[PDB]
Amino acid sequence: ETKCTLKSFTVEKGIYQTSNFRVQPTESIVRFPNITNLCPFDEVFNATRFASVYAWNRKRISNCVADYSVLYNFAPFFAFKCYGVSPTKLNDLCFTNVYADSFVIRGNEVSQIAPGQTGNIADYNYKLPDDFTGCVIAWNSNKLDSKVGGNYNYMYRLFRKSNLKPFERDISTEIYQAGNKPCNGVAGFNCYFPLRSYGFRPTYGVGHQPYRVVVLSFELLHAPATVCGPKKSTNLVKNKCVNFNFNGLTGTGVLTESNKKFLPFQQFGRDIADTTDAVRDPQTLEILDITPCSFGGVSVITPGTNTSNQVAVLYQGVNCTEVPVAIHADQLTPTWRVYSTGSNVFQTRAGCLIGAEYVNNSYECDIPIGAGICASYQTQ
Amino acid sequence: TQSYTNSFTRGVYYPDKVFRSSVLHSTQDLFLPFFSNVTWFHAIHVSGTNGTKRFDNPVLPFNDGVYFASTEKSNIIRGWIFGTTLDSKTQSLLIVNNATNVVIKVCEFQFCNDPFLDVYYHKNNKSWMESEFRVYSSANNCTFEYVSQPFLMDLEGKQGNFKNLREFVFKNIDGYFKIYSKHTPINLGRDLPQGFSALEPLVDLPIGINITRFQTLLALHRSYLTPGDSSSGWTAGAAAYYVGYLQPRTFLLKYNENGTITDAVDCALDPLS
Amino acid sequence: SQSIIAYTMSLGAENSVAYSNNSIAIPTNFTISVTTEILPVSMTKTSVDCTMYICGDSTECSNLLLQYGSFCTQLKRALTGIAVEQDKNTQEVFAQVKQIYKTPPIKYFGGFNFSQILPDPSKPSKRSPIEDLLFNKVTLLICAQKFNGLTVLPPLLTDEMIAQYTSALLAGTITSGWTFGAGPALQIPFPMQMAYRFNGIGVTQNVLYENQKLIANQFNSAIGKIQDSLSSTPSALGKLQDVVNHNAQALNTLVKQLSSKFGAISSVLNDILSRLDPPEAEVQIDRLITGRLQSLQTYVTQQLIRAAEIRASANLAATKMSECVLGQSKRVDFCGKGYHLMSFPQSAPHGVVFLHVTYVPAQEKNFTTA
Amino acid sequence: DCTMYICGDSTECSNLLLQYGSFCTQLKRALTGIAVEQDKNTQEVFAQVKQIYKTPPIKYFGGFNFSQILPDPSKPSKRSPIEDLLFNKVTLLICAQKFNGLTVLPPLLTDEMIAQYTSALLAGTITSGWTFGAGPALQIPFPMQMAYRFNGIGVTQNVLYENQKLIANQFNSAIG
Amino acid sequence: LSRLDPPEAEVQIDRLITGRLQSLQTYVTQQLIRAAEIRASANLAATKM
Ligand SMILES: *[C@@H]1O[C@H](CO)[C@@H](O[C@@H]2O[C@H](CO)[C@@H](O)[C@H](O)[C@H]2NC(C)=O)[C@H](O)[C@H]1NC(C)=O
Ligand SMILES: *[C@@H]1O[C@H](CO)[C@@H](O[C@@H]2O[C@H](CO)[C@@H](O)[C@H](O)[C@H]2NC(C)=O)[C@H](O)[C@H]1NC(C)=O
Ligand SMILES: *[C@@H]1O[C@H](CO)[C@@H](O[C@@H]2O[C@H](CO)[C@@H](O)[C@H](O)[C@H]2NC(C)=O)[C@H](O)[C@H]1NC(C)=O
Ligand SMILES: *[C@@H]1O[C@H](CO)[C@@H](O[C@@H]2O[C@H](CO)[C@@H](O)[C@H](O)[C@H]2NC(C)=O)[C@H](O)[C@H]1NC(C)=O
Ligand SMILES: *[C@@H]1O[C@H](CO)[C@@H](O)[C@H](O)[C@H]1NC(C)=O
Ligand SMILES: *[C@@H]1O[C@H](CO)[C@@H](O)[C@H](O)[C@H]1NC(C)=O
Ligand SMILES: *[C@@H]1O[C@H](CO)[C@@H](O)[C@H](O)[C@H]1NC(C)=O
Ligand SMILES: *[C@@H]1O[C@H](CO)[C@@H](O)[C@H](O)[C@H]1NC(C)=O
Ligand SMILES: *[C@@H]1O[C@H](CO)[C@@H](O)[C@H](O)[C@H]1NC(C)=O
Ligand SMILES: *[C@@H]1O[C@H](CO)[C@@H](O)[C@H](O)[C@H]1NC(C)=O
Ligand SMILES: *[C@@H]1O[C@H](CO)[C@@H](O)[C@H](O)[C@H]1NC(C)=O
Ligand SMILES: *[C@@H]1O[C@H](CO)[C@@H](O)[C@H](O)[C@H]1NC(C)=O
Ligand SMILES: *[C@@H]1O[C@H](CO)[C@@H](O)[C@H](O)[C@H]1NC(C)=O
């Protein structure tokens, strides 16, 4: 390793730093909340009718376990575009309170459903902010909801004063003033109704074939999680390096019973540099401290390879007792373990020394380790 | 009754859900500016024998949240109402708690009746309630019922001299309505003591409506130690009912070892600050 | 009635002297005095891991990092020369003698009193009272927090070896005069050494052998005053405390820099890898990594500049120890304000404190000369 | 100032700059140590003595001529001819342009204070020899001060008093 | 700011800000080096005086 890091075939006398060593995780745990209630996406989907865009609906889903896999059993999705989240990994996250906006609208303008898009849908009839983190789903609805005589349940706002803000509803039923002539009357020239019906003829082609559309605005914030994916909880493990997944907070470290009195509304135990120092178990209200694994640097003490071919190893800043636990088959970044617990492991204020014999004499410093400790190549 | 005073060090609350210990952390949120002035509104009960009007529920513009304080022994105020119109044309919200539970109902109310006031108003013998629930007449198509635990049960007062300060801060932001509460037991000598006490969060509710005005619901059936004075402007008196507004300011908070916000300093008040 | 008042400075008290073409003022009395001086010698030894700091044990971030180039190789190389330099500086300032002299069992140096600076055997650590004051005065879970890849290495020479060097120098300079810097040490009584040192600055020996008692009393009083002068004044050790503050604040800013989005969705790698697919998370990782690289580069550059600044003072301290202590200096205003006699090199955390002994004329009288 | 330089008082640029990090705070703290260092340099070079000596009203220093370096009270600013020549030789809408956020701070010691230190040092060294650096000033006439200085470099005293006129003439010629 | 909408102009601002940051950083580094160089000569002048 020293030859590799020096990029040479001959190393001189001295102490060299090569790499670091880290203890590796042994097992994994998963703890998801205490809920078994299914969420009713079928209510949004298997609906007799959809409210039109001019007054968009809104349903809140929370406090229920959800599985989007059953969503695949309903219909082929025309677009199914998830903007801020990976669609595949939607079953591994826990959220606060997802939303839902359902409506039937012509399928030739589906591209207008995006943050900062153009057209009437994105300007005068609806809008999404530049902070959308969710998904959009659509599927063909021309055949199911149409009329040979002309379906007129979809008068949509098309005139208004200024572009409506995202996540705001306007249901002002008034005759827009479209000219100089005063619009005090019911109707007339320069007094136009902003709402226009649709010619939902079943014989029309794909030019104006309406689709059903659902918009999910996932709520992502540091708050108690209500809706969650379909996973199974396990048993927590203490005093052992585990890959904990507490409510979706992936990490690695050892867990201990914490000693800080959380408040009832308190959830995390964050500290400087955005590290979740302490966290409370979702199943039973118990709090725990997270401590990172044992990590350190390694250095190779060698005489000149011209003279001999023996080396010693120094682990910087780790107690000697933790090394045998760290010593296993492929357990550290220096996967080699030839020394393991070898020749007279000696503990020094600088670190843990392997491969050297302490002596009760004194000479000049040949190769310096530190804290008043030096090493040398001597017989007996 | 119109009066002004100074809020020394009131209006500090936990910005979010997280634990910290012995940390001087800076935040930039909506807080009550330090050493600001708060208007005083007082109940007026004059000539209880006759039916002279009182009208102690004036409109308040509700500019970006409200801080409210009171020092009532009994639940003289039983709740609040919030709405841009407070009528059936738009949506309204009501928060009232009776002896058992609380009720929060964002609903389309045709019209809200006046707070319960009796013509006799015999506070000498009016220490009981009877038929004091018929409010807002009827309801309409509406949702989001939150019949749950009430806010205040009681803070028992013994030997007198123990007025219980109750402080509530209400804020509506990005579709959520949040209420933080704190009940300080000791009144000491001054009406508004100069101390430090954080406001632990109480409730967050996802309503998402339009609000530009609110009104207070008092138990006008019985009222004592609520006289009236004709002072208007920068005057003094007594209100037992304090309201103040919130501002987007930057604060620095000092979390002790136990995790309690012991002290805080403003960043736009004084050049020393 | 206290307030804030603004004014122009005063450039010292005005004074004038009478210059006459036949007149001369000659002193008649002298005064010994002791002055202190403080010099930083070395700072802390640090080390950094590039991959651990930049990426939290994620493999994809590691692949991107190695794809950019060999930047952190040289960023790790640069921080390695600094530690060797600090060890060399501490080696150079103190280890001037290759012997370890020892003070005699009976300590009577012709009436003088050195017990305030000699080693103290009663204390568990063989320090000296002034050294104890200096150690206690400087104030060194927060340290454990700085383990995000950052590490601090221990000094090669612990405080005990520094104390032994200091004691050896101080024993040699009071037993053998200044001859232990040239060749083999030659023993000599103290009063004769002090007579030589007066003769060095143009005052004959027939002064010391009369005013021995007075000089000894003045010397003892001055050393006695030094301890209270050091303790009472608040910012006397203001130069040995700036080093630790600069180190701590640099490391604090470096570790706090991780809580910055740099225009990305999140500030934690795991959340990004959990929320997004590889081909879209690549741009987020790429945008996140560059800010951390710049922070690390800034840190190492400031460390280099500060190390050079410290090395200048280390060389100056080595020169002063060579000249003022191991001999007598004729240079004006180098080893104290006044005519220079002796020096004593006490130790102190991350530095060294010199005690200079001087000689100032006291009582004057003017005559007419030709 | 970081924000004024980077952003033309725009709000969005301010938001982006603040979300980048603590870079410009560190730059501001970096450009502050240098100013204090400059002030300490100027204080350390000149402020060696804590007294302000003055020359006697009559100026006859054993034949030497110091009028070229001593302060001239006739001039509006109490400088000396050499100082005036040096000050005039160095040449300092250019300044007005450099106000896009940049600022130049003023020196802590004005030029008059520097001149006063210079005159104090120059008068003290002429009048009291070199004894005003060790302790109290001790007056001594100039000819025996120069006798001491020759005795320093291995030339005995009986050279100066004999060659005083020639030495003074050479001194004046060189200083001219 | 005036000719373009926010969501498109943000990337332009990000491109415009980094060059100015780098210019400022280079300036302060050069000032630091020159300050050290001047301090050396200041110490020499103090010694000579
Ligand atoms: C000593 O005294 C003063 C100066 O200390 C000098 O006397 C003046 O000398 C100049 C030049 O020779 C004459 O122009 C003045 O007229 C002298 N003064 C007076 C009052 O006459 C000179 O250096 C010495 N003078 C004596 C008398 O010893
Ligand atoms: C030089 O100064 C010293 C200190 O002021 C003088 O020593 C003092 O002498 C008086 C009278 O003999 C004593 O009462 C004091 O106790 C002495 N002081 C100390 C500290 O011992 C000394 O006398 C002065 N020189 C001359 C020639 O008078
Ligand atoms: C040298 O000076 C020290 C410092 O004062 C002397 O130590 C003091 O000795 C006296 C009497 O023995 C004690 O009352 C003091 O408490 C000691 N000082 C301290 C700080 O403990 C010492 O005696 C002096 N030695 C000689 C030979 O004069
Ligand atoms: C000292 O030197 C100055 C500088 O030259 C002399 O001043 C000159 O005096 C002569 C005759 O009075 C004038 O012609 C010159 O113009 C003067 N120089 C200047 C710059 O004005 C001064 O006389 C000399 N004094 C002594 C005592 O030697
Ligand atoms: C819910 O909590 C109870 C105890 O509070 C526990 O016995 C039960 O196993 C939990 N349910 C799940 C699914 O973990
Ligand atoms: C190894 O050492 C021997 C003797 O010390 C010397 O003769 C030889 O040249 C060396 N070889 C190398 C490759 O340095
Ligand atoms: C290493 O751990 C053991 C376990 O108790 C402990 O006794 C020892 O003191 C530790 N090492 C050091 C240097 O403290
Ligand atoms: C070496 O010295 C140490 C000092 O404490 C002692 O503990 C140890 O027993 C000694 N070893 C031998 C072999 O004498
Ligand atoms: C605030 O109230 C005070 C009285 O407490 C009054 O003097 C002042 O005019 C009010 N308005 C301010 C400070 O703007
Ligand atoms: C308080 O209000 C709740 C909510 O409707 C009601 O169920 C309860 O009966 C009320 N208690 C009374 C009126 O005493
Ligand atoms: C409430 O409606 C009014 C009417 O235009 C509007 O100005 C205001 O912005 C609305 N409230 C909110 C929070 O947008
Ligand atoms: C923290 O709370 C405990 C709980 O009893 C208390 O004993 C302790 O005094 C508190 N700490 C401080 C600094 O008040
Ligand atoms: C000594 O100097 C003083 C002023 O410092 C002066 O008054 C006195 O006359 C001088 N001595 C003689 C003998 O002139």
Author numbering:
A (entry chain A): 298 to 677
B (entry chain C): 25 to 297
C (entry chain C): 689 to 828, 849 to 1078
D (entry chain B): 737 to 828, 849 to 932
E (entry chain B): 981 to 1029
Share the article's original sentences.
Owing to multiple mutations to the spike protein, including in the receptor-binding domain (RBD) and N-terminal domain, Omicron BA.1 infection can result in substantial NAb evasion. The Omicron variants that have emerged more recently contain similar RBD sequences to BA.2, with the addition of L452 and F486 substitutions—L452Q in BA.2.12.1, L452M in BA.2.13 and L452R/F486V in BA.4 and BA.5—and exhibit a transmission advantage over BA. We expressed and purified the prefusion-stabilized trimeric ectodomains of BA.1, BA.2, BA.3, BA.2.12.1, BA.2.13 and BA.4/BA.5 spike (S-trimer). We determined the cryo-electron microscopy (cryo-EM) structures of these S-trimers at overall resolutions of 3.1–3.5 Å.
All the S-trimers contain Gly-Ser-Ala-Ser (GSAS) and 6P mutations along with the T4 fibritin trimerization domain for increased stability. Of note, one RBD in BA.2.13 was clearly disordered, representing a stochastic movement, which, together with BA.2 and BA.2.12.1, suggests structural heterogeneity in the S-trimers of BA.2 sublineages. Of note, S-trimers from the BA.2 sublineage harbour relatively less compact architectures in the region formed by the three copies of S2. By contrast, BA.1, BA.3 and BA.4/BA.5 spike possess relatively tight inter-subunit organization with more buried areas between S2 subunits. In line with structural observations, thermal stability assays also verified that S-trimers from BA.2 sublineages were the least stable among these variants, which might confer an enhanced fusion efficiency. Additionally, the BA.2 subvariants displayed slightly higher binding affinities for hACE2 than the other Omicron variants. The results reveal that the lack of G496S in BA.2 sublineages meant that the hydrogen bond with hACE2 K353 was regained, increasing their binding capability, in line with experimental observations revealed by deep mutational scanning (DMS) assay. However, we found that BA.2 subvariants BA.2.13 and BA.2.12.1 showed increased immune-evasion capability over BA.2—with BA.2.12.1 exhibiting greater evasion than BA.2.13—and BA.4/BA.5 exhibiting even greater evasion. However, group D1 antibodies showed reduced efficacy against L452 substitutions, with L452M (BA.2.13) causing mild escape, L452Q causing moderate escape (BA.2.12.1) and L452R (BA.4/BA.5) causing severe escape. Since group E2, D1 and B antibodies are sensitive to mutation at residues 452 and 486, it is highly probable that BA.2.12.1, BA.2.13 and BA.4/BA.5 can specifically target those antibodies, rationalizing the large decrease in NT50 of plasma from individuals who have recovered from BA.1 infection against those variants.
